Design a protein around this nucleic acid. Structure first.
Ligand SMILES: [Zn+2]
Ligand SMILES: [Zn+2]
Ligand SMILES: [Zn+2]
Lengths: 317, 118, 290, 667, 146, 55, 121
RNA sequence: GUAAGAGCCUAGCAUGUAGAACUGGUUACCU
């Protein structure tokens, strides 16, 4: 027993939201906890009331599967991307698309907003990321250098400003100013389909079917290796209390400590009634801004909402 | 042959904005004109980041959760005929409450196939 | 890709005899005569009766081969590229066929624009090892007959109606039955069958040079033009570089010094270093065999 | 970077699904697997989707279960995509929105495939879950039919005799009905050619054909596969069945013979309504004056209500048990004929990749399916009315009475059910209630279905075509009486046999509070308003109205106001939409001839009901301008007008298109 | 943000190439040291000063050179070491249990092969579908005959 | 001059722009020459605007 | 069975490495010549110095040619009888039918019996 | 029976270039 981990309370499901007619491929929470977005395979973006779990609005306009959705914290905007090859900007003041970001060659898989510059960074199946100016809808740079499809992207204001994992099993840490690669991290054996940034401690983790790896930001130093959750993991998300969440394509989801990397909870949730036993799967998860709800976007066309169990310690290894 | 799948996609980085803006082309579309040339920012009542920083979200979320749960709680002659009352206790049998993840067995699909095939 | 770099890379016989130059910069004016991609054309006038020379090749195609952008001669020596590669190795092998040339140009442009921007990217390490025969026929003072307006082709038909006002020369063009007349741009640039460089190599081959030790194991050096103003104590101070020096016979009457070394390799090395180069005490020391 | 617009959508979906499967199989394989084999798994995914569309169970005998589960996952994803696209496009083609002709054919081809998946499911569930008919109930149905047939002294139809003197006439009638099909067209494949060749052989040697028909009726009990396709009427789809020619000739003769021997034997009483001597507008007129000629029908002084019920037998075709059908047909005809007709309904239905067996229902596309439908409908008319009231309506067998007539005045007012017609699967009953009967029946309904919140007035559909003064008023007694009458008629039928549904039915009560009863019959709706009730201005100038006289007094008591039903208006609009499609739509005379045929169909069916409906006149003007604009775009002509209307409306002998008008156009 | 906005302006300058067509006269000076000294070169000097004026662009002049010329992608930057783990040992059993059988389709025969009939009809699901009858047909048939 | 310098740079010697801006083929064209010499709304808008001004 | 491209490498290596026989004369000659640096670490110095005499490179090339030949014999060609009722119209068709008999031959064994007995049972 | 390979034949549209490299030589001792 080299470390002793922090005690985290167990998480439990309390709400299953239903109503998409396709796989729910993305989810994001508004900065003020009033609502959350989902984007799905039925080409609709749905605004859901976060407290009551009720469908607030259904936006249409993508021609194919919506892959990523993010809400702007500085501007009153909603960015989305699809398998449409299209990257849209929704003015939430009007509930209408005002700008489309054109130039990707194949399906756009992810996007992240830069937190301080008004820059949008997207990934595609064409083995490139792109860097867009929001106001002029122009490609600033084309981050090229991956050899297979590019799965995920995260942005910062500190150094390396752009971080991406891809389906050629590597991770590239980039320079936003120059537009060239700074660090290549080849440690994973299978496709990196999730990366997540820590809110305080200036590290990041990344996930793949072999195992999940933690890393210091300036030059990608190896810090740790968190293993045991062996499936194609689609997302990673972090609570400021140091709770890592790793969800996968088999529907399983393991709850981890950030610091020591201790698996304290495994949640293998049940599918929807009509659904099929092979259709269990998670594509997206998010914490709310209170960091006490856990929103998962499932392959049985549902949203599941979890909260911490108020029945204290029954736990400790 | 002619009819074939892909097995490798096209890689971006070799055209019109990719390396030198295709060596600075003077070609531009109608969709590349100046339009929406001013970013809107969140105002003080909208959700400006100064307004979002001091807030305790868990208490407000618990209040809204409580109000929503309270709203959902407060909401809720010829006697000689060969067949008697067949529908005795059928109080409409709430099929229209169930959501079923099967597109051939949804209640929407059953209504659809009943409505559009004669 | 475009080229677009400020202030061209020029020699001193094309940049002019005036230290005050007014040049114009056109952003993507011409295409390169080699690369065929457009570059930044600089146009200046060297002197008074000159020609308004301009840069012919890219910054990149001059960084590849360490040349001036308009005379296409070495920045350091002022010689054709075939002469300098003759006095060096030739390991660049720039492609001449079409798609290979543009592909090689793209990749070398990425190579140069992924570096500092100061060194002749491949020619540097071989440019350390130098001072072959090219230094003994390097031009000392600028040849300002290069910067000179072309023959007036109306005066060739005896019909120059400008007369005294025409800024083109009224003098004979060269007889085309001459090897020194054809001279393509790419022939001057790749170092292939350049007749100027052919004549420079024919002169530098008949330059006076070492002879081998005709008889076996003889290390004897026959020094004429020794001089009676120098001392033999300085001779050993110049000569212990080579190896195990044997006896040194000195005859100051015929101004001949006789030298013996350990191996004939050391005598050949001394012949290499010494012959027609070595001037000590400001006085030429001639060494021969026999 | 080309955009995915409209012609790239399906190809791009299949381009991206295949890439997603590529990524998942690269991540699913463990560490030391040879990293080939992506192409083979993609071929298996293609095969699983083709077996999904074919409703073929897909199972590869050895295949790793992660690959099998992943292929099932992505096949379910593409299935949801295909089906939701079909829903969206069907709602567009129904509402009239702009659709391509290719997506019309694509939507038809998807919809017939989804129908056959549901139909294979239904036939399998019938063979799995037993009969629904619940043998007690089938014995009740059979015994009621036996008592009805012995009550009428019915003489059972024999086998068609060897020296039947009328059989060549029936063969000529059958062959004329078969050759009327291939008269419009001229492009015929091998099966049509065989059908016409068998028709010509049957004309050229009739007794060999009659020997063959009677031999098939005696011996053959296994039949060939029938094809199926759909007729697209843009509001719903219609099953069309394709039968082999020899079987079709045998069924055609059987159809002619059975209807002839049914008319001689007076099998169908006069409420079996698509009758030979009554066009449907004559049927509506006869129904109106039959309501008028009931004794004291409009008097509401002591408290009496007139109720009109219109509904259907919802899945009457779909739910006929073939064993019970065999039993009822052995009651009617020879056991060989009954076995032929029963075994003919048990065929294999084919559409491109799809085959299943009709084990439960009946094929509507049979030649003699008319007889099965009208006789099974007779059985359920006996279920609804009961044998006593049906024997009063039909009269004695020695002196049977015609359609809306009784033997005496005293037998009219014997029961609440006064009039009753069944047009093929739709029911029309007239009810006369005294106050006591109405109170008792509403008491029974509110006993069985209590309503403390007065919610009966919510779900009650009223007709929105007529204006506000003209519709049915919503009073509590009348609403509860209408729901109670519907409840009581609904209880009389087992749900396993057929059912009657409130959402498709309309009930109308005439009372001291309601001055009008609305009814809807063959495709025009009408309301009758009597002069003794609230009229206040005894007028006669309009042509849409009907001044219908009382027979006894020879005086006009009530008026009938006619309008075209919205379904018939929408059917005419869909017919014109069908004309504007159909790629021979540049010919300029084909278009005008189809328009003229549709327009005189509409008019000469709905003669005086057309001018009383303003929405149908506006639709006629709009459709006429549509086909004129189509001709003009055939000359391209431009947006600008003053295109001369003499080219359209000149008779076809002076070179014109011959176009008929039903709009206010001036030259 | 200051580095990004400049590249943004250089991209957006295409979107309106000529609106208030451009202006160019910041005529500048540059001091240059020939690195060739040994003087016979300037005339005897060590440096030379050059006045650069930018050549004035014709407003009415189309683009000069062909830009549509297309060449294959160059080599990528030198490969990074792959840093994997030792590698889990693979068994014959699991190597054989991840083998994929060839798809024999009922519909597609791209290279027009000829497949044996037992292989062609190896659709097991329509052989294990097992049409199984209910026992309530018996009550119905018997009651009807009685 | 502008419109027929555009014509002559495209090597379409079989077309003729007259002095009233009517574009007619000099000869009878093959399919390849006809597909090569199809212009768009830019050329024909400029040609018809110049027709109005020459009127 | 196969299981790995590295296990086959290791088997091939153990074969080749048991086959080789060292000559101690050259070994002890180089040992006495090199002395202390004959037992090098990772960072010794001698990486860029060794020049093999002609007999050494001849031995290497002969060994490598033997190894290439043994690798070329990896798939032994099964003999082609023509008494089997052929089932293919092509040369690739035959190999596809062979792969199909490998994979689905264990299952489609009743239907083969039906096809030979006259489509019966 | 097409207006396109191919494939031939003859043709004509861009350039106003960079460059010119040419000289030096002595002889001598003891047995
Ligand atoms: Zn160049
Ligand atoms: Zn120069
Ligand atoms: Zn002159």
């Amino acid at each position: 027993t080299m470390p002793k981990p922090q005690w985290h309370p167990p998480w439990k499901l309390y709400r299953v939201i239903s109503g998409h007619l396709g796989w729910v491929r993305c989810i994001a929470v508004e900065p003020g906890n009033q609502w959350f977005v989902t984007g799905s395979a039925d080409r609709t973006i749905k605004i859901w009331d976060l407290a009551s779990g009720k469908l607030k609005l259904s936006l249409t306009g993508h021609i194919s599967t919506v892959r990523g959705v993010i809400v702007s914290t500085r501007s009153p905007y909603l960015f989305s991307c699809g398998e449409d090859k299209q990257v849209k900007c929704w003015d939430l003041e009007y509930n209408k698309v005002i700008r489309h970001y054109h130039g990707h060659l194949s399906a756009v898989y992810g996007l992240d907003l830069h937190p301080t510059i008004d820059v949008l960074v997207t990934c595609s199946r064409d083995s490139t990321a792109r860097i867009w100016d929001v106001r002029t809808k122009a490609s600033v740079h084309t981050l090229s250098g991956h050899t297979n499809a590019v799965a995920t992207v995260r942005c910062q204001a500190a150094e390396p400003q752009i971080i991406t994992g891809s389906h050629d099993t590597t991770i590239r840490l980039w320079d936003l100013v120059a537009g060239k690669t700074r660090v290549t991290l080849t440690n994973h054996k299978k496709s990196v389909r999730a990366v997540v940034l820590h809110p305080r401690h200036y590290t990041f983790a990344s996930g793949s079917p072999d195992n999940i790896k933690q890393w210091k930001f300036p030059d990608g130093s190896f810090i740790q290796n968190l293993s045991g959750h062996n499936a194609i993991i689609n997302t990673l998300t972090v609570n400021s209390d140091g709770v890592l969440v790793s969800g996968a394509d088999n529907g399983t989801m393991h709850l981890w400590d950030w610091r020591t990397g201790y698996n304290f909870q495994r949640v293998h949730a049940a599918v929807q009634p009509g659904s099929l036993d092979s259709e269990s799967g998670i594509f997206a998860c998010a914490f709310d801004q209170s960091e006490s709800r856990l929103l998962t976007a499932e392959a049985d066309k549902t949203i599941k909402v979890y909260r911490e169990d108020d029945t204290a310690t029954e736990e400790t290894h | 042959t002619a009819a074939r799948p892909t097995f490798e996609p096209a890689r971006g980085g070799r055209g019109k904005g990719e390396g030198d803006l295709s060596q600075l082309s003077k070609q531009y579309s109608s969709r590349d004109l100046p339009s929406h040339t001013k970013i809107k920012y969140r105002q003080t009542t909208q959700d400006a980041p100064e307004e979002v920083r001091n807030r305790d979200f868990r208490r407000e979320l618990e209040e809204r959760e409580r109000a929503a749960a309270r709203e959902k709680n407060r909401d809720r002659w010829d006697d000689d005929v060969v067949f008697k009352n067949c529908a005795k206790g059928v109080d409409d049998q709430k099929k229209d409450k169930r959501f079923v993840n099967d597109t051939l067995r949804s209640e929407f699909h059953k209504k659809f196939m009943e409505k559009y095939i004669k | 890709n475009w080229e677009d770099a400020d202030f061209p890379i020029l020699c001193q016989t094309c940049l002019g005899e005036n230290p005050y130059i007014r040049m114009t910069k056109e952003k993507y004016g011409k295409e390169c005569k080699i690369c065929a991609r457009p570059f930044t054309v600089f146009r200046w006038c060297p002197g008074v009766r000159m020609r308004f020379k301009k840069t012919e090749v890219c910054q990149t195609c001059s960084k590849l081969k360490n040349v001036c952008q308009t005379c296409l001669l070495d920045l350091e020596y002022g010689l054709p590229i075939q002469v300098r590669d003759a006095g060096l190795s030739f390991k660049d092998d720039m492609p001449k066929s079409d798609v290979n040339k543009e592909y090689y140009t793209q990749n070398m442009e990425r190579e140069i624009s992924n570096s500092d921007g100061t060194r002749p990217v491949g020619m540097l390490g071989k440019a350390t090892s130098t001072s072959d025969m090219l230094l003994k026929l390097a031009r000392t003072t600028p040849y300002y007959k290069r910067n000179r307006p072309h023959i007036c082709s109306f005066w060739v038909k005896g019909e120059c109606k400008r007369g005294e006002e025409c800024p083109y020369r009224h003098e004979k063009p060269t007889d085309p039955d001459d090897p020194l007349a054809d001279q393509n741009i790419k022939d001057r640039y790749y170092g292939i069958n350049d007749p100027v460089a052919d004549k420079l190599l024919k002169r530098a081959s008949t330059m006076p040079r070492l002879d081998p030790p005709e008889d076996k194991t003889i290390t004897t050096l026959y020094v004429g033009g020794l001089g009676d103003t120098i001392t033999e104590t300085d001779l050993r101070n110049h000569f212990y570089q080579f190896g195990e020096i044997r006896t040194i016979t000195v005859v100051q009457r015929q101004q001949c010094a006789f030298i013996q070394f350990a191996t004939r390799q050391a005598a050949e090395v001394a012949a290499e270093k010494s012959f027609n180069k070595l001037i000590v005490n400001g006085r030429r020391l001639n060494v021969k065999w026999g | 970077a080309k955009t995915v617009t409209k012609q790239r959508v399906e190809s791009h979906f299949d381009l991206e699904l295949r890439a997603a499967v590529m990524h998942d199989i690269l991540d699913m394989m463990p560490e030391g697997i040879k990293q080939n084999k992506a192409r083979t798994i993609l071929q298996h995914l293609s095969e699983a989707w083709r077996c999904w569309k074919a409703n073929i169970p897909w199972k590869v005998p050895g295949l790793p279960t992660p690959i099998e589960n992943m292929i099932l996952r992505y096949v379910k994803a593409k299935a949801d995509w295909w089906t939701n696209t079909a829903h969206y496009n069907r709602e567009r083609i129904r509402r009239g929105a702009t659709v391509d002709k290719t997506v019309c054919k694509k939507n038809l081809g998807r919809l017939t495939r989804l129908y056959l998946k549901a139909e294979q499911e239904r036939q399998h569930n019938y063979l799995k879950d037993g009969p629904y008919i619940t043998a007690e109930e089938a014995v009740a149905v059979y015994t009621t039919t036996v008592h009805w047939l012995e009550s009428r002294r019915f003489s059972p139809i024999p086998f068609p005799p060897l020296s039947y003197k009328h059989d060549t006439k029936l063969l000529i009638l059958a062959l004329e009905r078969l050759k009327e099909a291939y008269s419009v067209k001229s492009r015929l494949n091998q099966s049509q050619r065989e059908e016409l060749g068998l028709i010509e052989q049957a004309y050229d040697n009739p007794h060999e054909a009659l020997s063959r028909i009677k031999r098939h009726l005696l011996t053959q009990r296994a039949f060939k596969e029938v094809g199926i396709e759909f007729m697209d009427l843009y509001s719903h789809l219609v099953p069309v069945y394709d039968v082999e020619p020899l079987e079709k000739i045998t069924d055609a003769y059987l159809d002619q013979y059975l209807w002839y021997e049914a008319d001689k034997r007076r099998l169908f009483p006069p409420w079996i309504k698509p009758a030979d001597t009554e066009p449907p507008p004559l049927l509506v007129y006869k129904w109106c004056q039959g309501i008028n000629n009931l004794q004291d029908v409009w008097e509401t002084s002591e408290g009496e209500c007139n109720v009109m019920l219109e509904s259907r037998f919802e899945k009457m075709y779909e739910k006929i048990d073939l064993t019970l059908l065999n039993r009822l047909l052995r009651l009617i005809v020879d056991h060989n004929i009954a076995d032929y007709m029963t075994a003919k309904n048990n065929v294999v239905i084919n559409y491109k990749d799809m085959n299943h067996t009709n084990s439960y229902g009946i094929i509507r596309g049979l030649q003699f399916a008319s007889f099965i439908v009208q006789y099974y409908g007779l059985v359920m008319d006996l279920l609804v009315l009961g044998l006593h009231r049906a024997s009063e309506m039909a009269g004695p067998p020695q002196m049977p009475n015609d359609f809306l007539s009784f033997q005496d005045i005293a037998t009219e007012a014997a029961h609440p059910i006064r009039l009753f017609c069944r047009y093929i699967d739709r029911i029309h009953i007239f009810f006369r209630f005294t106050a006591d009967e109405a109170r008792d029946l509403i008491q029974r309904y509110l006993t069985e279905h209590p309503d403390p919140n007065n919610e009966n007035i919510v779900g009650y559909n009223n007709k929105k075509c007529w204006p506000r003064d003209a519709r049915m008023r919503l009073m509590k007694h009348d609403v509860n009486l209408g729901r109670a009458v519907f409840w009581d008629i609904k209880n009389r039928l087992p749900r396993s046999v057929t059912t009657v549904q409130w959402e498709n039915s309309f009930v109308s009560v005439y009372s001291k509070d309601n001055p009008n009863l609305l009814f809807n019959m063959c495709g025009f709706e009408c309301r009758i308003l009597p002069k003794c009730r609230t009229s206040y201005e005894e007028f006669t100038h309009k042509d849409g109205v009907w001044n219908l006289q009382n027979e006894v007094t020879k005086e006009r008591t009530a008026q009938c106001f006619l309008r075209v039903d919205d379904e018939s208006m929408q059917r005419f609009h869909n017919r014109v939409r069908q004309i504007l499609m159909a790629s021979g739509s540049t010919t300029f005379t084909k278009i005008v001839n189809k328009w003229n045929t549709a327009l005189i169909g509409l008019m000469t069916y709905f003669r005086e009901a057309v001018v009383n409906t303003q929405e149908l006149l506006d639709l006629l003007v709009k459709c006429e301008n549509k086909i004129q604009t189509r001709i003009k775009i055939g000359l391209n002509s431009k947006m600008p007008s003053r295109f001369p209307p003499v080219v359209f409306y000149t008779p076809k002998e002076l070179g014109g298109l011959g176009m008929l008008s039903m709009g206010h156009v001036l030259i | 943000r200051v580095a990004l906005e400049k590249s943004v302006s250089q991209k957006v300058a295409a979107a309106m190439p000529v609106r208030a067509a451009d202006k160019l006269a910041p005529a500048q000076y540059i001091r240059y040291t020939p690195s060739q000294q040994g003087v016979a070169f300037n005339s005897g000097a060590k440096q030379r000063v050059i006045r650069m004026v930018e050549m004035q662009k014709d407003p009415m002049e189309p683009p000069r050179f062909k830009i549509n010329k297309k060449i294959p992608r160059g080599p990528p930057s030198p490969p990074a070491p792959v840093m994997h783990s030792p590698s889990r040992k693979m068994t014959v059993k699991e190597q054989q249990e991840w083998k994929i059988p060839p798809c024999i389709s009922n519909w597609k025969n791209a290279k027009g092969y000829t497949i044996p009939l037992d292989k062609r009809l190896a659709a097991d699901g329509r052989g294990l579908q097992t049409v199984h009858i209910n026992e309530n047909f018996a009550k119905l048939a018997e009651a009807l005959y009685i | 001059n502008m419109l027929n310098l555009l014509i002559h740079r495209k090597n379409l010697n079989y077309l003729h722009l007259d002095y009233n801006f009517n574009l007619k083929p000099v000869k009878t064209l093959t399919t390849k020459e006809r597909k090569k010499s199809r212009f768009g709304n830019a050329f024909h808008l400029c040609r018809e605007v110049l027709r109005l001004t020459k009127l | 069975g196969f299981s790995d491209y590295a296990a086959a490498q290791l088997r091939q290596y153990h074969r080749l490495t048991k086959q080789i026989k060292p000559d101690m004369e050259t070994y002890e000659r180089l040992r006495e010549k090199h002395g202390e640096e004959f037992f090098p670490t990772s960072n010794s110095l001698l990486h860029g110095t060794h020049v093999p005499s002609t007999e050494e490179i001849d031995r290497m090339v002969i060994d490598l040619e033997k190894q290439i030949e043994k690798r070329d014999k990896y798939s032994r060609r099964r003999p082609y009888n023509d008494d089997a009722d052929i089932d293919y119209i092509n040369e690739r068709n035959a190999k596809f039918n062979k792969k199909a008999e490998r994979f689905y031959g264990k299952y489609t064994a009743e239907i083969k019996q039906n096809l030979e007995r006259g489509t019966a049972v």
